[PDB]
Structures are given as structure tokens and as C-alpha cells.
Amino acid sequence: HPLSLVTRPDLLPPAIDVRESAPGTSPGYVFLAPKTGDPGTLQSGPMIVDNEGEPVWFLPRGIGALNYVTAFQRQTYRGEPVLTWWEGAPLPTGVGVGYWVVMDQSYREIARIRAGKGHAGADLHDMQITPDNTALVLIAEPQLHRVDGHARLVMNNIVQEIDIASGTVLHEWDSLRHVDVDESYLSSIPLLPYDYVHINSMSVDTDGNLLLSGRNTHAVYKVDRHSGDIIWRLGGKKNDFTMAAGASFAWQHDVSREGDGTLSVFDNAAAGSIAPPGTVSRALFLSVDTEARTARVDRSYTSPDGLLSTSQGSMQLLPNGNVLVGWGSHGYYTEYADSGEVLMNASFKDPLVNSYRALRFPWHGRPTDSPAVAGRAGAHGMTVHASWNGATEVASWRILAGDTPQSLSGVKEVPKDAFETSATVAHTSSYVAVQALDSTGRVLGTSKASRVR
């Protein structure tokens, strides 16, 4: 697991093993938020890696076990590509109270999305920036609710649509207001708040209505954007559609409408003893017929390692037709072709490290700092180390050497082959520096002059 970096001893990004990387893997980078279940004694935060698992960007923003990072992905705000992730405190039911960070391509925070007034914070499970520059945020707050005549404590879910610039709440959807408690499949703990629906995904369908994934009800709800009425229920105790054998899902995550028209559902299909022997989690693409009220499996993708993710997970349809799956509780992620052939299979070197999602996006990082450099003298001469956290366009490094910071001269150019590239030179100098070069040889940035040690 994380070996020391010479130029950045403050960064300890988790290591990843790519057991298979066949040709045809979609371009772009993989977005992860590694965590040690929670405080793991290892760094955690948003991470961007390449197809070899080598880190491209890593930002430690963990605060022990009182405040951690999850649900890292790329979104679009005001037509510009941005980074979003969640930070906050965990709760016993597995939900959290926190906020969402919005950061630009220069890696500075440009916005922070919080729950509306009157609520402690937003839940960690999902958040979606709409093309209307609004925020779909999930609030999970305990409320007293009369079930079977008994007053009980239940885990209510509120979905708010919030303008980013003003923070004003434009729409609000109360789950206890449309979904009954006895629709849940989860057994009742007498002291814990009854997490009856446990929404973990929010998506906007092609018609503008909302698609909400209820984990503990095994159901997907189509909600009118304005009136808040439930259009239909897919799965669960009040299912509107006819299901085949393997079309029914359970404890599912990450539901969205795809370009081909199918509905994507990550069927975890199990929980942690609170599943039939042999079941595996599967990535589901379903064709739903609203006229006949039926839904069948278009295609499904299973793990080559026979994994059964009891929680978390993600799926993504890539532009070339590939399917990228994040196995959630299991620290694996797999990219398939349409035919189901495995193109990329990767896992964290530490088995205790996992990520909520594993998504692929193109990214163009423009760091506002300078490259980091370090030089160590020796018998051969000098060994020069170079890194630039967040830089995506660096193709090679130019090594500068000189006796004074003002008399630096270029001695050697080497390709970038890792997050931190190391190269030796047959000379010994008093100062070294590096220049990051893109594929055409244009200079992207220059490090400070570093005294050789």
C-alpha cells in the first residue's frame, strides 16, 4: 500500500492493482473516494486515477472518524466541468450529515451545497447538479411518525431542489408524505430510527420527472417534478410492473435513465445478514414498458470475481458502449464491453479500502501551484524526482540543473511514467528544477529551484 513520495511526503494515496487492462478501455480517468470503511490510519479523500491505477490527483480531506469524504464524481455547473464530493459526519443508520463541495478545474472550491434551512445537513448517498444550475440534495432527518398506532422514530428522507447561487429551496419532497412505512423490507430495530426507504440515488428522467432509488423498499419511484406525486413504483411491495425471474432487484443503488432508453439499476441483491447462497451482485439494464406495465432485463453484467456487494456500488454507461461498474463494499471496479467481455479489472491493494462509486470521466486539470521537484546527489550524479498533483496534460519532464537558481540549464528530458517520475543524470549540480511539458513539447509549468541534497 502507499509508498512514500519524495516530492510530496504529505500525499499517501491508496495503491490499486489492475489485474487486467485489455485494449478498448474507454478514455478518461477513474474517479474514486477511497475510505477504510469509515479511522483506518490511512489517508482518504477524492482521488483521480488512470487506467493503470496510478494516481493523477489526490486531496486528503479526512478528519478522523468525525468527518470523511465520499461520493466523488464529475458534474457540470454553468456549462463548466466541476468536481463534487460529500463531507460530513456519519450516523448509526449508515446515513450522514454534511455538505457537498463544488470545485473547478483549477482545484479551488467555487461553491458549497448544503441542505435547506431547518435541517442539520445533507445525506451522503447522492447529489445531482441539474442543467438548470440547481441542486438535488438528500436530507435524512429522524421524525416521529405514527405506525400501527404506535409512535415510533423513523428515518425520513427529504429531497430538495436548491438553487446553487442563492441556496434557496425551490422544491421539497417528503418521503413519509408519499411512501408508507410498511412498504419497507428492513427489520425493525427497537432503538434505532427505522430507516424505512433509504433513498440513495436521484436522477432526472428524459421527461423532466425524478427517479428516486429506495434501497430498503427495493423500489424505484418516478416522482413528478412539481406536484411531487408518485407516477409509478418499480419493484417492492407495491410494484406497478410485471417482473421476470432475474428482473427483480433488492437493496439496489444508482438508478438512472440511459441514452438507449433502458433504466440502469445496480442490483446489490443482498445485505449483511440484517441472501440465498450463491447470489452475486449484478449490473442491470432494464427495458420498462409504461403502456403494458412490464419490465425485462435488457442485459446484465456480473463480477469476474463472483462478488456480492452488501452495500454501495455504482454503474455507468460509457460513450463507446462500455459499462463501468463499481462494486461498492468490495474494493473492486470492472469495465466491460457490450458483449460482457472484461476490459479492465482493478482492486485496491489494501482489502480494507473501498469506494462508494467508481466512475469514469474525461478531465483537464489546471493546477494553480507549480510542479514539485527534489534532487538527491550520489555516486552516479543526481536523482531528480518530479510531480504535479492534479496535472493531466504532462507528457514529459525537462530536468534543469545549475549552480545558482538564475543559471539553470536544461540537461535531459524524460517521459512521465508515474504520479512522481524519477530520473538520474550523470552530473552533480547545486540546484535542479523541472519543467512540465505536454505532448507537443510546450511548457506547462516550472518548479522552483531546489537545492540538491
| End-to-end CA, the chain | 27
Q: Find the shortest distance in angstroms from Cβ 126 to Mg ion.
A: 5
Q: Find the shortest distance in angstroms from Cβ 203 to Mg ion.
A: 7
Nearest Cα neighbor of 70 from 124, 148, 107 is: 124
Measured from the CB atom, the residue of 35 and 357 that comes closer to Mg ion is 357
Q: Find the shortest distance in angstroms from Cβ 100 to Mg ion.
A: 11
354: DSSP letter: B
**161 interacts with Mg ion by CB under 5 A:** no
The set of cell numbers assigned to 265 is 439499476
Query: To 5 degrees, how large is the angle CA 324–CA 266–CA 15?
Result: 45
Q: Give residue 115's identity as a one-letter amino acid code.
A: A
Q: Which of these segments, 15-23, 97-105, 125-133, 225-233, binds Mg ion (CB under 5 A)?
A: 125-133
Measured from the CB atom, the residue of 197 and 325 that comes closer to Mg ion is 325
**Interface size with Mg ion, residues (CB under 5 A):** 3
The CA distance from 376 to 381, in Å, is 8
Q: Find the shortest distance in angstroms from Cβ 264 to Mg ion.
A: 6
Residues in the chain: 453
Q: Give residue 451's identity as a one-letter amino acid code.
A: R
**Residues between 342 and 381 that touch Mg ion (CB under 5 A):** none
Q: Are 441 and 365 in contact (CB under 8 A)?
A: no
**Residues between 272 and 301 that touch Mg ion (CB under 5 A):** none
**Residues between 70 and 89 that touch Mg ion (CB under 5 A):** none
Measured from the CB atom, the residue of 256 and 268 that comes closer to Mg ion is 256
Q: Which of these segments, 58-66, 126-134, 205-213, 402-410, binds Mg ion (CB under 5 A)?
A: 126-134
Measured from the CB atom, the residue of 160 and 256 that comes closer to Mg ion is 256
313: DSSP letter: -
Measured from the CB atom, the residue of 136 and 307 that comes closer to Mg ion is 136
**254 interacts with Mg ion by CB under 5 A:** yes
Q: Find the shortest distance in angstroms from Cβ 313 to Mg ion.
A: 10
Q: Which of these segments, 210-218, 236-244, 256-264, 269-277, binds Mg ion (CB under 5 A)?
A: 256-264
Long-range contacts of 11-15 (CB under 8 A, 24+ apart): 11/43, 11/58, 11/60, 11/389, 12/42, 12/43, 12/60, 13/43, 13/47, 13/55, 13/58, 13/419, 14/42, 14/43, 14/47, 14/348, 14/349, 14/350, 14/353, 15/53, 15/348, 15/349, 15/350
Measured from the CB atom, the residue of 358 and 433 that comes closer to Mg ion is 358
- Give CA separation, 96 vs 33, 89, 123, 400, in Å: 16, 6, 5, 49
Measured from the CB atom, the residue of 256 and 303 that comes closer to Mg ion is 256
Which of 36, 43, 128, 134 forms a contact with Mg ion (CB under 5 A)?
128
Q: Find the shortest distance in angstroms from Cβ 326 to Mg ion.
A: 9
The CA distance from 377 to 383, in Å, is 6
**262 interacts with Mg ion by CB under 5 A:** no
Q: Give residue 59's identity as a one-letter amino acid code.
A: L
3-state SS assignment for residue 182: helix
Q: Find the shortest distance in angstroms from Cβ 244 to Mg ion.
A: 22
Measured from the CB atom, the residue of 11 and 318 that comes closer to Mg ion is 318
Measured from the CB atom, the residue of 8 and 222 that comes closer to Mg ion is 222
The backbone region for 108, taken as left when phi is positive above 0, alpha when psi lies in -120 to 50, beta otherwise, is: beta
Q: Find the shortest distance in angstroms from Cβ 416 to Mg ion.
A: 31
Using only the alpha carbons of the chain, give its radius of gyration: 24
* Residue 17: count of CB within 10 angstroms of its CB: 13
Q: Which of these segments, 158-166, 177-185, 254-262, 411-419, binds Mg ion (CB under 5 A)?
A: 254-262
Measured from the CB atom, the residue of 86 and 194 that comes closer to Mg ion is 86
Q: Find the shortest distance in angstroms from Cβ 253 to Mg ion.
A: 9
Q: Find the shortest distance in angstroms from Cβ 295 to Mg ion.
A: 18
Residue ranges binding Mg ion (CB under 5 A): 128, 254, 256
